[PDB]
Please model this.
Amino acid sequence: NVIQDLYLRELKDTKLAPSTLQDAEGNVKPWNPPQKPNLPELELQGPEALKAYTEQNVETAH
Amino acid sequence: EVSSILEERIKGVSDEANLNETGRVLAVGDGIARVFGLNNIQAEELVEFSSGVKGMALNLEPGQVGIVLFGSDRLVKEGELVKRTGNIVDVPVGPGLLGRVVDALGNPIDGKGPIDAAGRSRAQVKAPGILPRRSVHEPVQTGLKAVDALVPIGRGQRELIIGDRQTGKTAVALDTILNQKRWNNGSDESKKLYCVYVAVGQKRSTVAQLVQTLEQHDAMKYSIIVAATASEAAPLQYLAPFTAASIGEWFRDNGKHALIVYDDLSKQAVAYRQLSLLLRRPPGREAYPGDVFYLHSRLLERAAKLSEKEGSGSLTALPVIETQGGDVSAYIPTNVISITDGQIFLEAELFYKGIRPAINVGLSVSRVGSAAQVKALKQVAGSLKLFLAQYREVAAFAQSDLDASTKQTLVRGERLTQLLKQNQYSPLATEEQVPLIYAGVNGHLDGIELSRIGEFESSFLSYLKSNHNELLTEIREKGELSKELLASLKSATESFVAT
Amino acid sequence: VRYEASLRQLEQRQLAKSVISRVQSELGNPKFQEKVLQQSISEIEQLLSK
Amino acid sequence: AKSAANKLDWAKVISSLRITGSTATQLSSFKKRNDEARRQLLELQSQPTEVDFSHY
Amino acid sequence: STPITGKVTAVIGAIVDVHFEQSELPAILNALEIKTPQGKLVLEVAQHLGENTVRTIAMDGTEGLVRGEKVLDTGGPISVPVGRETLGRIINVIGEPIDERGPIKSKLRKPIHADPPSFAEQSTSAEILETGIKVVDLLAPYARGGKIGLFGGAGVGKTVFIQELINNIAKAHGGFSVFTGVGERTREGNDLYREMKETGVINLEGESKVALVFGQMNEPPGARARVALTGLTIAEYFRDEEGQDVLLFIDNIFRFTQAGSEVSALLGRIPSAVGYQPTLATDMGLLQERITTTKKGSVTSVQAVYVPADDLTDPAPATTFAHLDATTVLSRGISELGIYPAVDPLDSKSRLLDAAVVGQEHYDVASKVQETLQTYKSLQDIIAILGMDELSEQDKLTVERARKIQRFLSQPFAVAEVFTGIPGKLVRLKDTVASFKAVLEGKYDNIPEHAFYMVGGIEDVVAKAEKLAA
Model:
């Protein structure tokens, strides 16, 4: 009686709706782009490198 | 869409008025609702709630009748109807549970195929008479060479598979189900064992491998898997071996055979313990109930090989018992060991030593054993017991160098031992077990290096199929070796050993 | 792909809660009187037969 | 290239025999090889960037 | 009508009884809340004793519970927060932040209980974890879907083992994780929290790669029990709705077993298995089934486990051994010997090890290892009494390779820079298979034992042959 009655009103006035795109989007992973590769590692730049490498290995040994 | 299917189902549900006797929960705790009313009610009869939980009535007493709840404690409250269905626990039995994984309740949990039923038979019944019996003499081939010869297998013949934890207990058992595919393929239905694997208090993850492996080898069209999992409650686990055996009874009564592999009674006991302790039943050995014995005994005495009158059928059984490092002196192993006729005892050492299966066949005996054994296999492996038997005791002598005698025994034993090391999940026919063992016995395999044993096995088999597959088919179907086949069988081994 | 799969389930779940929504209307409306009585008389017919 | 680096390292192993100490000969040879092997497996993981709008 | 009033009737430790009014009709698994100076004491109804009177377990202090003090009825289990914004925050057992940065962000909430996924939902493994630890990787590797268990005694570096796996594996994989701490010391929490903040696994902005759920042992026995149910629920949310693999971690899961045992006697449930809860199988069973691979996510737990009295033939570990897929065994002796980790070579076993799943070469190599060590251990007896020169030449050589192998298990870790002080190594699965093989084939018995001591991958083994010579 009541099972049928309740179910008719609910089925008729409310179908299967797909969600909004906006609601879906939020609930999924965002997408971020790639940021900054890298600048290779310094080991002095300028003539700071030049004077220093030449002076440090002047020594050799027997 | 989906709603339509559901719409179909909704209409098929109506208001139901009439209901019989009832009770109302007074207090519910720990899965033990305690009910007021249910005066006249059968012993261990089924009750259905108003919240749709099921129960059984272990306790009947006049003040309160103490229901034991199977499901949730969250749908059961105070002051709730408990309708008396009026039917003691019974579950459907049919032929339709072939290829069907069912829960403890008998419904498909894999979601494949309907249950074609014909009757519902009680989970507990009583074991047939003395006159409903006939001696055990029917072989059964497991596909492992060692088990079939040293401690043969039979029909309505139960004998343990008691061993240590994750040492390939399941591999000893699985090989047999896969071997029962052989009879199934033909059409003599008095040779068809319709296997049942009963996973009790064993999780759904483990079982998912169990089903997967069956499916790959096309063995879910006669295997039945009754499951009461680790998560599923103590009534379901307590009632899982009783539900499974009962399915087997339909087959058995119609004149057929079927086979039940229980895994594991170590877990059946644990569930009875949970039930006893919450209903405050008497204590016993090791803190498991004292009355556990009675439980196991009732289940194991229905596994029997019946008279020809009862159609010439049986319920063959193979319980699997989980040990805590090889303890057999433990209260639950000890009960089962006395009840059943035979044991197989797997060993941890063999496992570590890279021999898998790690079945150890010296400490295996079958009480009834070889009365059920193929004639062919008895001739070529009587010898085989006496050769391996000496080698164990003479392997208590270890290397520098030894007597001329002692060293010989090790050479013979060891080639045989590597022969009986086999890969798992690989069954064998009667026509390919019988030639190999004869090679060992007659010392054409024990004249050949250890390393080359594994090689020898396949080559010799192929060599026999190419030259004379007539002798193999003859061997198989006669079931026995005649002097004309025994002449030939030596001749053949010689040409093969030459190459 | 996961959420699309999830969505077919959700759609049914929205209809579950909808049953609750008609339930509210029944107890507000004189369905609260009339259907309780549809229920009562059927119980009278069944119980007379016992 | 990468093989020139690895040939040149073996010239440097026998060089470190002739001088005393090999304080940054070794530290240099190890760094060069190492970060060369790392960029190579890094590249095997690297695919061009595409989105499959005709399957998913 | 449902009363919103209960008056407390008996405080006997953690057990708190309430006297609800007319019409209440109590239901198990509800949550009662009592206003208290220490917040809101949560009570999880675990019995009704009849006539509107529950017997409940406390999740907060009862050293200030006043009798006669009003007890509201909240209903069902408590609801924690789940999401992806629930990562890299420290969440209490009652669901509240002890990391003190406003509330733990939500979208949706679910309760600490969940029904276990049905047979139809279950699906198999197909991915193979690689930990980067040479002993685990050759003799028992884990696979996603698995319920890994780190069995050992005390002093075998239990936290350190658990720490190692986060240092490597956690960064590597594309999924998020959940770290759950069950009943552990105030030192250990802080050690985990600092070390991984620095390593960037914990970040103050959400959407991390771990979660933190610290439940501690100076909280009543019921809280220690339901810290685990709380963290687990975050992982189910990942798995199903947000469709991401989890590499869950729980610590120490004996505090979960031991906790149930405490409130078991007092609730009336007389001990079984000798000193343990009679509900040991089912509580485990429910817990383990939630952690699995289904139609979407694969939640592969790494669980610490404590073996009491260093004896693993005792009923509490033995029951568990069944429940876990990929056991390892650790011991005091191995750790002290200088062999890191203390994992034993023959006792590390998986039910996920197949000869095809890990490939034929791998399988054959790990079997040879299992044999050579086992001959070594049989020979120990002979060598003790008889002497080492009354061994055959085949035997003597197996002793020798087995010694090389035995010291080829030793690899230092970064999180065991409190022992050796030498950072960790990453060792690829193929590199373990190839270097062990070489020893066994007899082509790499030119290498001494100490050059397999303290090495990474293959490249390392070669590098150490040169160093010792000079």
In short: Chain B touches chain C at residues 2-3, 6, 15, 17-18 (CB under 8 Å).
